[PDB]
């Protein structure tokens, strides 16, 4: 596409500059261009890709939630019918969000996942696949809502199976995957008990593996562990 003429290393460089500048749409476009060069991504490059799109779709989600809440109140008993505008603009944001999710899912399917053989890349990408189907599910209503939910579940489950076989319990990717799959259970799949069980088991098994880590590996790990605890406190 429009990044086809730019060197891979230059795209990576500019993705890092965009991050520093909090220009996440640009970041995402640079990283999409880098993925489309066809080479596998390194560990640091995978993080650039995920950060970029997480921040883009995060903003879209926050806006969608604002508009959906306005829309719902606008459809209460005793609310003045204020016309089609709120629905229209919610739909506009929704379609843009879906477009970004489809773009990410397309990068993962062409051809990041199929070429990822090491656990740390394969689980990373399958977690992203679950995440972006989850974001599609957050806005889904039609005939394919259940299929979108199952697509998210299936990606998360494959990631979970690999992570438990191939990674230590304190691995940050394993921990973040469990965090998000637990949220998927609570918020998407109407399975709060599974969400709580997964978060607690994950936390406890990570606690018992901390003793093997250096001081630095004891960081993003206890960081994500605190998010698991935060969620458990919200949920119980």
């Amino acid at each position: 596409g429009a990044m086809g003429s730019m060197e891979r290393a230059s795209l990576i460089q500019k993705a890092k500059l965009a991050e520093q500048a909090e220009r996440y749409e640009d970041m995402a476009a640079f990283m999409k261009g880098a993925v489309e060069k066809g080479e596998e991504l390194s560990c640091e490059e995978r993080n650039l890709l995920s950060v970029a799109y997480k921040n883009v779709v995060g903003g879209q989600r926050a806006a969608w939630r604002v508009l959906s809440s306005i829309e719902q109140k606008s459809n209460e008993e005793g609310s003045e019918e204020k016309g089609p505008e709120v629905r229209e603009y919610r739909e506009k944001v929704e379609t843009e969000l879906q477009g970004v999710c489809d773009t990410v899912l397309g990068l993962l399917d062409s051809h990041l996942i199929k070429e990822a053989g090491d656990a740390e890349s394969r689980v990373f990408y399958l977690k992203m696949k679950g995440d972006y189907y989850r974001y599609l599910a957050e806005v889904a209503t039609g005939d394919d809502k259940k299929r979108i939910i199952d697509s998210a579940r299936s990606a998360y489950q494959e990631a979970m199976d690999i992570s438990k076989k191939e990674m230590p319990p304190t691995n940050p990717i394993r921990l973040g995957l469990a965090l998000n799959f637990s949220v998927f259970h609570y918020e998407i799949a109407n399975s709060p008990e599974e969400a709580i069980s997964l978060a607690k088991t994950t936390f406890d098994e990570a606690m018992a593996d901390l003793h093997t880590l250096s001081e630095d590996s004891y960081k993003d790990s206890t960081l994500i562990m605190q998010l698991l605890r935060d969620n458990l406190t919200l949920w119980t």
Binding site: D131, G176, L179, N180, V183, Y186, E187, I224, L227, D230, N231, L234, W235
Partner: peptide, 5 residues
């Protein structure tokens, strides 16, 4: 909302 990473 609950926390995700």
């Amino acid at each position: 909302f609950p926390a995700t990473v």
